[PDB]
Amino acid sequence: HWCRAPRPDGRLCERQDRLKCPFHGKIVPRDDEGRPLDPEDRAREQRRQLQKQERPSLTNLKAQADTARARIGRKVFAKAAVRRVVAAMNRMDQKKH
DNA sequence: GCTCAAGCGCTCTGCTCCTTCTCCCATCCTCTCGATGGCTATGAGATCAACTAG
Ligand SMILES: [Zn+2]
């Protein structure tokens, strides 16, 4: 099976995904023109398209942390995460021994 | 410009981690080997309460 989703470039999606295509969500069977064979699936996609159409001065201490690179560092550098890093490594140390 | 908001710092748990601290480790029996263990004097003053007379 193929996603066969209608891309903005006019070509059907050729991604080979078992269940879900990341750029188009769930994968449903489609014909040569990229139309879902199930009429219910066509209606659901139309509803999704309608929903999409409907849709001091200096950075404070909290505002400075509000970004991408800080968020990933906070998750990586955590008391529970570091302990889980050690705890996971302890279990392979038992396997190594 | 008059009310709901947005924040906001301060406080209250609280949640887990790390550290610290006390206890605990079968029963009974025999024997030997060692260690330990203390031992100033003598006299002077002064008080006091009990006999021994008065
Ligand atoms: Zn796709």
Curated annotation (Swiss-Prot):
Which residues are listed for Zn(2+) binding in this entry?
3, 13, 21, 24
Q: Where is the protein situated, by its record's location annotation?
A: Chromosome
**Could you tell me the superkingdom of the organism this chain comes from?**
Eukaryota
In the UniProt annotation, what is the result of changing residue 13 to A?
A: Defects in transcription-coupled nucleotide excision repair (TC-NER)
Q: Where are the zinc fingers (UVSSA-type)?
A: 1-27
Return the Basic and acidic residues bias intervals: 28-55
Impact noted for substituting residue 24 to A:
Defects in transcription-coupled nucleotide excision repair (TC-NER)
Function in brief: Factor involved in transcription-coupled nucleotide excision repair (TC-NER), a mechanism that rapidly removes RNA polymerase II-blocking lesions from the transcribed strand of active genes. Acts as a key adapter that promotes recruitment of factors involved in TC-NER. Facilitates the ubiquitination of the elongating form of RNA polymerase II (RNA pol IIo) at DNA damage sites, thereby promoting RNA pol IIo backtracking and access by the TC-NER machinery to lesion sites.
* Family, as annotated: Belongs to the UVSSA family.
Q: Which disease is it linked to?
A: UV-sensitive syndrome 3: An autosomal recessive disorder characterized by cutaneous photosensitivity and slight dyspigmentation, without an increased risk of skin tumors.
Q: Subunit composition?
A: Interacts with the elongating form of RNA polymerase II (RNA pol IIo) during transcription stress. Interacts with the TFIIH complex during transcription stress. Interacts with ERCC6. Interacts with ERCC8. Interacts with USP7.
Descriptive protein name: UV-stimulated scaffold protein A
Give the originating organism.
Homo sapiens
Q: What is the lineage of its organism?
A: Eukaryota, Metazoa, Chordata, Craniata, Vertebrata
**What part of the full protein is here?**
565 to 697 of 709
